[PDB]
Write a protein that binds this DNA or RNA. Sequence first.
DNA 1: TCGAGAATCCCGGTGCCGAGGCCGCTCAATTGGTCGTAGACAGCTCTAGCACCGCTTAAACGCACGTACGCGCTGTCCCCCGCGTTTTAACCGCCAAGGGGATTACTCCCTAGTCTCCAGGCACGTGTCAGATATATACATCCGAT
DNA 2: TCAGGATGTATATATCTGACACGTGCCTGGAGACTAGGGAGTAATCCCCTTGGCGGTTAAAACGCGGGGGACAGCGCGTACGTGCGTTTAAGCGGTGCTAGAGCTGTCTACGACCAATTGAGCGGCCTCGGCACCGGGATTCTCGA
Lengths: 86, 87, 98, 95, 93, 93, 496, 107, 107
Amino acid sequence: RHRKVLRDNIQGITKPAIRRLARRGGVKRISGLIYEETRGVLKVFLENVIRDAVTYTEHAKRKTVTAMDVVYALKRQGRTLYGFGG
Amino acid sequence: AKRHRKVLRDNIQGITKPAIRRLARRGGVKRISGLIYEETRGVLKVFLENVIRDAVTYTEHAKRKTVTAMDVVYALKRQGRTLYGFG
Amino acid sequence: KPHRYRPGTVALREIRRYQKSTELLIRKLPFQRLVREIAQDFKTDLRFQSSAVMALQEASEAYLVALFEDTNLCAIHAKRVTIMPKDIQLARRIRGER
Amino acid sequence: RYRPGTVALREIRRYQKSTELLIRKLPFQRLVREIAQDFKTDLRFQSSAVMALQEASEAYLVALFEDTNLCAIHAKRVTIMPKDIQLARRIRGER
Amino acid sequence: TRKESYAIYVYKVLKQVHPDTGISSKAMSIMNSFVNDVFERIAGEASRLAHYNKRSTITSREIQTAVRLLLPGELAKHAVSEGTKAVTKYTSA
Amino acid sequence: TRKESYAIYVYKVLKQVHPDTGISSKAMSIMNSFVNDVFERIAGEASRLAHYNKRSTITSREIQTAVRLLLPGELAKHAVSEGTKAVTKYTSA
Amino acid sequence: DLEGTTKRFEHLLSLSGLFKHFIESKKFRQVLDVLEENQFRESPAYVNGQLRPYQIQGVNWLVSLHKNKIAGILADEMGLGKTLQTISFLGYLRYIEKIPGPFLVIAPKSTLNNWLREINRWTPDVNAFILQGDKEERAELIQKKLLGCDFDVVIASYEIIIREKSPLKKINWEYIIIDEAHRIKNEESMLSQVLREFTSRNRLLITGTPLQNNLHELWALLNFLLPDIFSDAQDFDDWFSSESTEEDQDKIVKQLHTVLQPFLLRRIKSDVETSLLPKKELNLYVGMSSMQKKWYKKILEKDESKTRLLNIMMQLRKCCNHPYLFKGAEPGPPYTTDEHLVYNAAKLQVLDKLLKKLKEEGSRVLIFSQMSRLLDILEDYCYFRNYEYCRIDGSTAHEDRIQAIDDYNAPDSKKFVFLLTTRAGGLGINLTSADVVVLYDSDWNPQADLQAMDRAHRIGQKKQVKVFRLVTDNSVEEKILERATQKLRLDQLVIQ
Amino acid sequence: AKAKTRSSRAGLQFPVGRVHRLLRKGNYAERVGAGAPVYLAAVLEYLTAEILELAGNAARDNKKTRIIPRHLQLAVRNDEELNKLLGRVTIAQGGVLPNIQSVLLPK
Amino acid sequence: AKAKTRSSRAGLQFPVGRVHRLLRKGNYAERVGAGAPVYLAAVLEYLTAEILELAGNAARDNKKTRIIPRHLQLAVRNDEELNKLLGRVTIAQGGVLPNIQSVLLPK
DNA sequence: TCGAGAATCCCGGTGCCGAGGCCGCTCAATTGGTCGTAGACAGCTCTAGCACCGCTTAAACGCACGTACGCGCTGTCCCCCGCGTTTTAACCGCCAAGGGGATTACTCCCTAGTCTCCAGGCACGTGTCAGATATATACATCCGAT
DNA sequence: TCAGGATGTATATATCTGACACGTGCCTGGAGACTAGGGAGTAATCCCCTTGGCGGTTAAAACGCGGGGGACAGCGCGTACGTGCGTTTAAGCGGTGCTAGAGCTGTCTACGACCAATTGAGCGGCCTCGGCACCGGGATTCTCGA
Ligand SMILES: Nc1ncnc2c1ncn2[C@@H]1O[C@H](COP(=O)(O)OP(=O)(O)O)[C@@H](O)[C@H]1O
């Protein structure tokens, strides 16, 4: 219930993290312009699924985004996730 | 002798080379190779085979012997290709 | 000399003429025989209402048009203008189908 | 020193064999709270909500890079670019 | 022989938007199939949304949430406005 | 407080497939979610398959057609075989 | 418009008063109560030649219908000159009444060249076209010449008249003469719907025979003669109760000796005679071989077979004809040309016996079938017996249909048999050089067989004609044959 | 004691009684509300009017007075948010809206 | 009268009364049959036994007794038809099966 | 660097057939009135989320090399386009049967309810061994040269 | 072509820990017994799909040929990611409060279900008249050459 307003918000997703995440995908020779683009497309994905999860949270008149709300947002989004109940 | 029905150009070959030619012109492509045609007949045969299997399942459930248009609509909707106009 | 066009002018004129149109594009009786041939295997002696064959033809026409449009995007990514089998199978390897 | 291209294949063989969660949990926490501040204010979260959301986004982005690698090797290269990572999510049905 | 359809209502909405434009028959069938689709999406989503809270009935708050959740962006704002306007005018009478 | 979880049935099937292999709790949770997903797919498809025929009850033939329609190819034949075997043993005894 | 309507109704009632049976009990009852209170036997030489006295007899029947302003049906036999009676009636409106046009005749495409030969051969002073050609060339044949009004007689086809209904509404017709009119045996055909959209003064009609299947066919022929008289479907079938199919008291058919005679003129073979020789007909009831006895049970009782059972009367028709049409009754590859082929068809066993008796006599035969695939079996069997032949059939050609006839009608032609199908080649061909003609199966139209029986039995036939019908014992065909036998006495005993 | 349709109490065209009966008999939940069919009828009003108004403008473009499936195709997929709704659905007799890739036409 | 469960009449391990109650109270249709919960119990038996048998083989392959979600991941996406069923779902803590493209690694 | 020449769009005219109107009926909406019972609100409890702070150390970052891959440029074939001429198969019409899919309509049996006892499985405490770190033994594989 | 480090694999002692079993309370699964509706199953009516053939028309399809612009190997070269190494630095673990609010129970009504009268909106059937499709013809205009 406090606010430690810390800057440098989105690009805490660092480039060695994103490069490991690409090496799992099977890639070899990453360019230098992948990074800002991949932060953009991750933000787009996360926007959509959090919008739906907070809609499901707000409907049942609560304040805590649970895990089941996120599973339902992913369920109707197209991509089901097993492992977290439901 | 020649008294048999074995001498006939088979049935996927009715999808002629200019038909796929026109069908790619609507898609907006300028220059087409010579090996598109057989692969496209393969792709169409795969797609129709899945859809017509789902349609014959929906018919054979209801104890009919004739495929309706609502049948094909339900198959294409279940697969994720919903078709407006015939429902 | 007679009057010919450059290679490619007729192609763009055809593209304009079919994107402006709305007709049904691969013919009817060969497609009829293809549907009967493709469904003889799953169960013998079915019958087809003609609106069902029209529905199946319109759906396959729309699908195959969207596939060629995606293949054209992939070919123009490869710095060419011709489409090939390589990108007509990449464009549905990348789709989720193969 | 190694030849440039050996350590990369060793990292491919390492990170495809493990299963750990791969980007760090506290900056992802701050990213989710920063990006969910906009819709409703001052919410709560469980821990398992942030874990679910991280695991989903990670698997999404891994599959995206695999498809981008195919779409890069199609143009006869070995380097991914912005062009093919936006071709892939154009041709997927997302753009 | 009796078949029900959303035909005459689409014609009424056409004639209170465009006072002179007509609709064909194929387009009438295509928009009948459209409104069947959108009805089935919204009602099927509100079903499972009411199931997720162990709540038996389906009410206007469920349709509220489902239309906010199902159709995108700037369109949801106007749809919510139209729905609440109709519900207030209905309960006033 | 009461929570139903499919866990002991999965453990019984595990003890009669591999009689010595154990399972962690994360895998048990993930397979709980698997059977709920597959159950909801088959039941939700058989419901609309019964709605298309203007028939009110859901029956064995609906589940027959749904599990034939839903899970792909060669895997459907053995599932149909298991289902008919169980139903005939149930009605016979 | 009621000027001839008075002349038509009074000439209906100018004969025996059975016409009052329905006219009193029908707008068309309005003009009834308005009116209820109220030759040339010299062979006229405006034609270029002679007219036979029976031809004079028909022409006088036409001007009978002309002066009294009513229509008719000329349903005589071919070879008697239906064309020459028709042409001389037109010159009556050029040399006696002198009405120079217009005229429209409609015929099948195969006969159109024979008309304009026959016009100038007898009335050379007639200006007449044959409207042929494509969408380019027909425009000059309309705009430059038909719109130029420089014609008397227009000779069209059955199918160009469907494409060209719009430039022919501009001309009001004095005559419409429809030849070979089995096309309007349906009332709901596309051609008949176009015909009522025209305008006419007179409406003639020339066919070979009347109805083949039902009474319902014949009134639709007469509905488009004079629609003011009938215009009714309920009132013609129910008044007659469909061919007296319930009692055979043969007193309702006395009414056919009152109704048909003001409109019909059909004449018998005994006029000249045409072939100058009467003919015979036999039925050869043959059994089934043991192989095709299985296939009759493989279809119904559902027993190697693996057969689709879509058309019952057609799948079983192949079994009654020949087993090897089912493509699975054949022994597997490699395919052998062998005598077990004819062993499994009882008809071929007789046919092997029948051709041996007639090879000595040299009686060259004509063989008909309803299926071209069964001619393909006889295509190989005549080689396997080393018999020369030709095959005129559908999908051969048009130019091939000229030559192989001229092979068979050539003197000392060494061709043993000659193959044809039934409804294909009735186009006025000459095959009188053959003396015997056999069939293979029955047909739902008995006159389609009977018109095919006069392939060789026409003018120029000198030897005796025998007809042998291969009938399968206790099978599908003995139902079809008796149903075909039932329809044959029908139009026989109405007319004769 | 004289009837009044509750499609008119809300001031709509779509039938509230029909959508209430259909949402009941289509076994969506065990009990159905009172404001729920009214809310659905309103959102169907708005969506149908919106797609059909864009269709009317696209039909008026081509000097027509009667609308065609071609006009509904150009009404949907030339829009953005309505394209986002109807992205997965094909339309009969629709065709493709015109486009040619820019580095393909000659210069 | 001694109560005998009908998971034993059909001879199954999955419950039949539970799936009957859940199928009823999840408002799928308005009436249910008697053979439907038995049939669903049988097909859930078959699917669970099949995926768990492949996971058991893949666990014994890495010389481990107790199974991991990684082993479920390998057993799911190493088959073909069971990959075709679950092709759109992800899995928690699962990872990716090893493959490198062919013309990338040196030779 | 502006002329020839073919393609396309824009003008009239006919004509035809489907979209808009009206009419009758009939059956789902609508009204009015009980009647059980979901959900609405109030209140209490206890739990998991939030904010601190300190300590350790993997991990990110910013710097320098340095080679290898992206990219423009160059011939060089060679395969697909554009147009002209046969040729064939769609596309209508037509024959002649027959047959499977929709409406009443009527009478069994299947399933849902309802009350009633017992046992199944779920939560909650104990109390043991498979997985993991760890860690020093020996172990198989790319990298300047020759 | 062979020695040289830095990698990946048996390998055995050595802890924590979490899965597996055992033993207790209570919630729902079921046995059963009566009722009522739904759906099966015969039984007429009629109308669109099927087979195996005729006939004609006429745009599409098939083929062929010359030729030209695109795909495609080589080839040079110049930045630009890869690798490694010091140097910060912030994530991670481990305690320690502290309280917002998730969740559960208790009454107790507003409100849907359900029912029978009743009666106006909507659905088939009819006609009918302009909106659009089509056809010469004419003007414009885009693409091919100097
Ligand atoms: N008096 C006659 N003298 C010579 N030939 C005649 C005479 N009358 C008719 N014909 C011949 O009869 C032929 C007419 O054939 P027709 O029986 O009318 O054919 P269709 O029956 O097909 O109309 C003409 O070619 C003509 O030569």
